[PDB]
Amino acid sequence: MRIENCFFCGRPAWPSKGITFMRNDGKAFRFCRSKCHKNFKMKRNPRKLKWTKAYRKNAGKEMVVDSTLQFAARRNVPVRYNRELWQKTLKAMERISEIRARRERVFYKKRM
């Protein structure tokens, strides 16, 4: 199963949660709650509503740089099984969750 990123609301939506809209040209949108659903349905610009996450991506309140963000990317080629590969990935994630959390703290200290 896959976590879909909400296009407008920026929420990490899950299966059985949210709504989906496709247009005839063939670009895909997944929505989290019904509020952002009617936001794109009312032609609201996501770069005009202040609570959208991608607004704060351009606003500079949220990070754009450093390799942990480059770690956040969608893979393309699958990889065969190896049990050690999961634990060396899985125990990295408690490190990944730790380093992202302390980067949140120091950057907000930098803001204020």
Binding site: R2, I3, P12, F71, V79, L85, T89, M93, I96
Partner: peptide
Amino acid sequence: IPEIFDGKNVYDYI
């Protein structure tokens, strides 16, 4: 197999 771990896709992070 593992699919989701703490809300970040391990499959997208392999």
